[PDB]
Design a protein around this ligand. Structure first.
Ligand SMILES: Nc1nc2c(c(=O)[nH]1)N[C@@H](/C(S)=C(/S)[C@H](O)COP(=O)(O)OP(=O)(O)OC[C@H]1O[C@@H](n3cnc4c(=O)[nH]c(N)nc43)[C@H](O)[C@@H]1O)C=N2
Ligand SMILES: Nc1nc2c(c(=O)[nH]1)N[C@H]1C(S)=C(S)[C@@H](COP(=O)(O)OP(=O)(O)OC[C@H]3O[C@@H](n4cnc5c(=O)[nH]c(N)nc54)[C@H](O)[C@@H]3O)O[C@H]1N2
Ligand code: SF4
Ligand code: SF4
Ligand code: SF4
Ligand code: SF4
Ligand code: F3S
Ligand SMILES: O=S([O-])[O-]
Ligand SMILES: O=[Se]([O-])O
Ligand SMILES: [Mo]
Ligand code: NA
Ligand code: NA
Ligand code: NA
Ligand SMILES: [Zn+2]
Lengths: 329, 895
């Protein structure tokens, strides 16, 4: 253990994420282009509701129950998706006939159920859920490793799998309830999100934050009382950790969606209920979600009456550097 | 001690992963409208990755543009190293499309092309050669290379703005401009935005943040779309009409707004033609010629209600200015030449209601009504919420509430796109949207107006581009109109029977009267086709007609490309073009007001060359060819131009001045008012904002919003009437029933039961990135077509089954995605996946004909004339219908 001196903290605004996967791509092309890593998405974005990545990860088990470390499942490769491969050369350059089909026959994939969500027209609903390692204050992965290969950095709270200490025990994969450590079958090592510590060390925001196109990501140290992450988490209290009942105490938080149209009634007229079920959000973030939404709706309404709302200004983030450690590199 | 932590040394593994020795500026030269500033990171001569440079200068009080970018962009370097790259010149050895090639040298390749170009000119006509290269704003230097080439040898150019269906035909009809739009930063100024047939969560990815930020700052947003699209999850209200019925929705809103008097009368009176007077007998505009000997047929009347007498409004086509300015490409006529204040209402009080009598030249008397009066009567009768409800399936209450809110919130704006622009009758629908804006008076105000977004059509420095591409003048250049060219030469069957709409007669009459061009002349076949910077075969409407009828007329087809796309795959010669990060070019768009660019990070790879360099190299081999074939100089009677092929290179490069790519780029900057002063070096360091813009002042710290020179400076609108013109009293418009804005139901000539929708995907930029391995891994490994469960279940179709979609034009077999948010009665296929991808046959264009709306062929009515990309037939495709069934040759099980 030894608690960290500072704790790198993320806030994801589900009002702003457009599910463009830019962050998914940026992280991959920076850290996971190596051998054995083709199926790994340290950063991914899933449609909610949906299967997620890997499929049904929310029931894989892991984390803590009354302080007791849990041992969950190890997802099979097909739940991650065998990364599709293609023979372009044969068709484009070598005169081979036949379409450039994907192998294997598509049956699963990390974003397979994009924009499908739940509910029948005209009350279909979905939103986007970006995910990463949560650099937990109580990291299940770290306790589970029989080789102490996983450590929590004293300077910024970032959790890292030490690649030389790692002997491929996979206890961490069993125990992370977010399914964020990935076993590399080529090297026999676990790989996961490194919180972009080389960028952080240079005062550059992590790539999934700096390159976020929807402008939905906030990062900073939660001890800095002038940071947007302190403001959203501690002050206005509108950002919640994903699945708190897992007992890992994440340090990635979500502002739940308050934007969105209303449930349409049988006569075609609006209800007062949102198309996004409250019950779905409570499933993700627990029983505080109602009060957070009331705060968000109340503050947005002041802006609508031409009044001032500093909470709204924070979410707007008119300047990127108000949201994050400098993104410039 | 270092002062370093226990595991610091090992962590050097990861820090090494984020390192580089060179950083250069890059851009993605594709038709996406991003024009996103980027840095390119290379180590040991290999490009390692790119990242948004995030260095557009902010404006006060509103969100910055930064970082922009998108999912394709952050893997753009994949096309440097990927399995798609053209490395060497290729000459075909099997049949077109087989992918059977032999490698050639540049010499052999370019000599083959040169031999054929000279022969074709010698034996037939110069206009049997053409170059297709769209959207100059994407990469003006690369665009200019082929165009300058054609310009000197006499080949003809194409159009793209209207061919793609993106030219806002109705706005040109209404406002007399090619088009204009606010930069997206201005969205933040609006209180009320209607997203009308626009899906910016997937199709304006780098700009979409402004929308949700507007909402958090208190704006309300409405999505109008048949399916529950990705954008729609964040809006406050969702309206879902039947496809192509938006016209009824908009006219019913107009009705409510007029009947309840929620409109800006002062604005209507000053800026539109709604006060202009219409003769009850001929239903034409009362004109000065009708009343006064030798009176103009292009001057008009309104009834001044404060003096009880008729008055000739100032600024119409017949009113000439002062000093006359030069023609301005994006205007009907240069109305900038007029003085400020010119069409200011002063103390005039033009009547909008009533009937009046006036005395003709011949002495007899005619009743006249103002346009607004006619419009108002027709709306009260035909466009009630209750009637529009029956048509659109939107409730009458919803329509009324939308109407009131749109007219009460200030500023309000409409944002329209492909969903409303790609229809047969999109011209009348945009006129209707412009009627809604005009009624509420928000045109020319920040956060207001009718704002269209589509592709990368707008290059603000357009005169600098015309300088480099067409240096002897646009009037000494051949243009076809590509929609017509495809229709005629691919011998298309549009399935519209003549007795309903005589497309044939209109088209033929438009051409023989010289209203629209026809290339080649004298009925010769097109013989030589250059295609680059656009995947023209893959994206072409009427594709099956093209492959079967047009393609075999072509003796030589040349594709110049970074990658083997479908067009190239079906070409005779394929030449290797340098990647975006191995070349120098400008890069701009209408979405933001800044000049982007790319520069070489490394030398062009393999044997690839930049587009500028390729047509320069071709120019020499053509000189040589022309000497061999003893055909160096020839007459070109159309332009009274004696052309000298033996001096083509010097022509290309202005006697060697512009032989480097960077000089060509700087030549562009130097020759437009919007850019003169800016250097390549400045741009290399940081994006620069344009010095000025098109129809408004470009002001410091303030988002551009168009048309202010008319709305604010009271210069006349460049239309026949000199106003925003909603009455078009031309014969072809009466013929179609569209002299006024009104509802025109979609073409049902395809006698099949599903409407065919083909919207743009977050996972590609048109065909580019369709075949990208990573993009495909974030989908289901191939192209997709979407169906409602309510249509799929009775058909026995399961999620991810193969399905077959067809009509009289063609057939496509594609894996299905069942999505609840899709509206029953239609299917959506993400447009134009590449032919060689995961399809069992055909593609999205197989089931689309080419169709031409007669109103788009009018070329003799004031501001309605042909100019390339200014006016012309739109290549619509949304009226298309198809049948669908389960494909049973392969039914794999799921797990
Ligand atoms: N049913 C239906 N049909 C529709 C549509 C629809 O909505 N529904 N949409 C339209 C519309 S609006 C458009 S804008 C067209 O799809 C645009 O296609 P385009 O060929 O220009 O882009 P694309 O990206 O595909 O082609 C770009 C080509 O240029 C290559 N390239 C890109 N950069 C360069 C360069 O710098 N130099 C050279 N020589 N080549 C370059 C690129 O690889 C690709 O082959 C049309 N049809
Ligand atoms: N990621 C990405 N972005 C892009 C492109 C790309 O290829 N990839 N292409 C760019 C270009 S050139 C284009 S032209 C634009 C096009 O992008 P858009 O302007 O957004 O238009 P579409 O994608 O065709 O469809 C817009 C939405 O309107 C809906 N809609 C469809 N039919 C109708 C209708 O009849 N009435 C109404 N009210 N709505 C309808 C569609 O279902 C869809 O939800 O995107 C540009 N942006
Ligand atoms: S980039 Fe920002 S917006 Fe796009 S998906 Fe990742 S988080 Fe959502
Ligand atoms: S998320 Fe899983 S992997 Fe990341 S720290 Fe918490 S427990 Fe360990
Ligand atoms: S923080 Fe760095 S490593 Fe962790 S997900 Fe975001 S990008 Fe990938
Ligand atoms: S592809 Fe277009 S949108 Fe995506 S990053 Fe490059 S420029 Fe911006
Ligand atoms: S449990 Fe430990 S040994 Fe490696 S596989 Fe996981 S870090
Ligand atoms: O940089 S990689 O694509 O070789
Ligand atoms: O240039 Se636009 O027609 O995509
Ligand atoms: Mo387009
Ligand atoms: Na193949
Ligand atoms: Na011949
Ligand atoms: Na690839
Ligand atoms: Zn790479």
């Amino acid at each position: 253990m030894k608690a960290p001196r500072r704790q790198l903290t993320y806030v994801t605004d589900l009002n702003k994420c457009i599910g463009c996967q830019t962050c998914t791509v940026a992280c991959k092309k920076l850290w996971t282009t190596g051998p054995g890593q083709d199926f790994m998405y340290w950063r991914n974005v899933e449609t909610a509701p949906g299967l997620g990545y890997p499929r049904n990860w929310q029931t894989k088990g892991g984390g803590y129950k009354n302080g007791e470390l849990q041992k969950g499942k190890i997802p099979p490769m097909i739940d991650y998706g065998i990364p599709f491969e293609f023979d372009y050369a044969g068709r484009l350059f070598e005169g081979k006939p036949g379409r450039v089909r994907p192998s294997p026959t598509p049956r699963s994939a990390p974003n397979w159920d994009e924009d499908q969500g739940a509910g029948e027209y005209p009350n279909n609903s979905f939103f986007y859920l970006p995910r990463m390692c949560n650099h937990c204050t109580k990291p299940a992965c770290l306790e589970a490793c029989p080789n102490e290969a996983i450590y929590k950095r004293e300077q910024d709270g970032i959790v890292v799998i030490h690649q030389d200490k790692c002997k491929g025990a996979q206890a961490c994969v069993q125990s992370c309830p977010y399914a964020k450590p990935y076993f590399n079958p080529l090297t026999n090592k676990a790989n996961k999100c490194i919180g972009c510590f080389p960028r952080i060390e240079q005062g550059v925001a992590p790539a999934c934050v700096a390159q976020c196109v929807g402008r939905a990501m906030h990062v900073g140290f939660v001890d800095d009382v002038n940071s947007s992450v302190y403001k959203l988490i501690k002050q206005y209290k509108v950002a919640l950790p994903l699945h708190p009942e897992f007992g890992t105490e994440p340090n990635v938080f979500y502002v739940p969606p308050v934007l969105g149209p209303r449930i349409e009634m049988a006569n075609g007229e609006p209800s007062t209920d949102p198309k996004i079920p409250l019950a779905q959000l409570e499933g993700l973030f627990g029983k505080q979600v109602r009060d957070v939404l009331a705060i968000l709706q109340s503050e947005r309404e002041k802006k609508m009456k031409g009044l001032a709302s500093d909470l709204m200004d924070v979410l707007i983030g008119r300047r990127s550097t108000d949201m994050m450690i400098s993104p410039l590199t | 001690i270092s002062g370093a932590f226990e595991y610091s040394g090992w962590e050097n593994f990861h820090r090494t992963q984020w390192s580089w020795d060179k950083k250069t500026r890059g851009a993605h030269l594709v038709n996406c409208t991003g024009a996103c500033p980027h840095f390119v990171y290379s180590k040991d001569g290999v490009v390692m990755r790119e990242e948004q440079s995030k260095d557009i200068a902010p404006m006060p009080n509103i969100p910055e543009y930064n970082p922009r970018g998108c999912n394709k962009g952050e893997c753009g370097h994949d096309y440097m190293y990927g399995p798609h790259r053209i490395k060497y010149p290729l000459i075909r050895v099997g049949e077109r499309g087989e992918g059977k090639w032999r490698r050639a040298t540049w010499e052999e390749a370019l000599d083959m092309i040169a031999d054929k170009c000279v022969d074709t000119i010698k034996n037939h006509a110069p206009d049997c050669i053409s170059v297709y290269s769209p959207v100059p704003a994407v990469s003006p230097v690369s665009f200019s290379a082929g165009h300058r080439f054609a310009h000197y040898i006499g080949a003809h150019a194409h159009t793209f703005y209207d061919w793609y269906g993106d030219h806002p035909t109705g706005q040109t009809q209404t406002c007399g401009v090619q088009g204009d739009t606010c930069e997206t930063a201005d969205w933040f100024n609006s209180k009320y935005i209607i997203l009308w047939g626009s899906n910016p969560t997937q199709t304006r990815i780098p700009d979409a943040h402004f929308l949700s930020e507007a909402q958090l700052n208190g704006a309300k947003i409405v999505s109008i779309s048949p399916d529950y699209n990705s954008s729609t999850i964040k809006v406050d209200k969702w309206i879902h009409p039947q496809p192509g019925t938006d016209g009824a929705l908009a006219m019913a809103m107009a009705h409510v707004i007029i009947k309840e008097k929620l409109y800006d009368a002062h604005s209507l009176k000053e800026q539109t033609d709604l006060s202009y007077l219409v003769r009850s007998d001929t239903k034409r505009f009362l004109r000065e010629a009708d009343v006064v000997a030798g009176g103009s047929k292009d001057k008009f009347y309104f009834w001044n209600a404060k003096t009880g007498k008729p008055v000739i409004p100032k600024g119409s086509w017949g009113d000439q200015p002062e000093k006359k300015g030069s023609p301005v490409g994006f205007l009907g006529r240069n109305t900038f030449a007029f003085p400020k204040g010119y069409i200011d209402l002063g103390d005039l009080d033009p009547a909008l209601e009533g009937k009046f009598n006036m005395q003709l030249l011949d002495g007899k008397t005619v009743e006249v009504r103002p346009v607004f009066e006619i419009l108002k009567s027709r709306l009260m009768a035909d466009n009630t919420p209750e009637k529009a409800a029956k048509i659109t399936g939107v409730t009458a209450k919803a329509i009324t509430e939308l109407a009131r809110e749109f007219a009460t919130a200030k500023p309000s704006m409409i944002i329209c796109g492909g969903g409303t622009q790609h229809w047969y009758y999109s011209d009348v629908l945009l006129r209707a949207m412009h009627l809604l804006t005009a009624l509420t008076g928000t045109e020319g105000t920040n956060g207001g107006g009718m704002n269209h977004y589509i592709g990368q059509w707008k290059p603000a420095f357009v005169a600098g581009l015309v300088a480099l591409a067409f240096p002897e003048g646009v009037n000494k250049q051949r243009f076809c109109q590509t929609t017509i060219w495809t229709y005629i030469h691919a011998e298309v069957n549009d399935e519209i029977i003549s007795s309903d709409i005589d497309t044939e007669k209109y088209l033929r009459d438009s051409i023989t009267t010289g209203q629209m061009p026809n290339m080649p002349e004298q009925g010769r076949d097109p013989k030589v086709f250059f295609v680059y910077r656009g995947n023209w075969l893959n994206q072409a409407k009427g594709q099956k007609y093209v492959l079967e009828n047009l393609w075999p007329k072509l003796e030589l087809i040349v594709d110049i490309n970074i990658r083997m796309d479908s067009t190239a795959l079906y070409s005779d010669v394929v030449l290797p073009s340098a990647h975006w990060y191995e070349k120098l070019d400008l890069n701009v768009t209408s979405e933001h007001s800044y000049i982007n660019m790319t520069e070489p990070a490394i030398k062009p790879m393999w044997e690839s060359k930049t587009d500028w360099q390729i047509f320069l190299a071709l120019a020499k081999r053509v000189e040589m060819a022309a000497k061999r074939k003893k055909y160096e100089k020839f007459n070109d009677e159309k332009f009274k131009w004696v052309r000298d092929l033996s001096n083509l290179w010097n022509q290309m490069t202005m006697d060697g001045k512009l032989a480097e790519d960077e000089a060509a780029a700087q030549y562009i900057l130097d020759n437009a008012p919007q850019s003169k002063g800016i250097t390549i070096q400045m741009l290399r360091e940081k994006p620069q904002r344009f010095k000025s813009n098109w129809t408004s002042p470009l002001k410091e710290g303030v988002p551009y919003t168009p048309f202010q020179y008319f709305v604010v400076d009271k210069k006349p609108w460049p239309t026949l009437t000199g106003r925003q013109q909603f009455y078009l009293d031309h014969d072809t418009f009466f013929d179609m029933g569209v002299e006024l804005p009104t509802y025109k139901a979609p073409i049902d000539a395809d006698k099949y039961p599903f409407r065919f929708n083909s919207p743009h995907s977050r996972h590609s930029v048109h065909s580019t990135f369709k075949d990208n391995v990573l993009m495909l891994r974030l989908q289901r490994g191939g192209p997709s077509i979407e169906m409602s469960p309510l249509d799929a279940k009775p058909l026995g179709i399961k999620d991810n089954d193969w399905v077959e979609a067809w009509n009289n034009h063609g057939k496509v077999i594609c894996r299905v995605k069942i999505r609840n948010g899709e509206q029953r009665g239609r299917v959506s296929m993400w447009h134009c996946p590449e032919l060689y991808m995961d399809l069992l046959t055909g593609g999205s264009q197989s089931v689309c004909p080419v169709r031409i709306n007669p109103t788009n062929l009018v070329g003799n009515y004031g501001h309605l004339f042909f100019r390339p990309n200014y006016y012309g037939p739109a290549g619509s495709q949304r009226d298309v219908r198809v049948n669908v069934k389960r494909y049973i040759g392969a039914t794999p099980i799921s797990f």
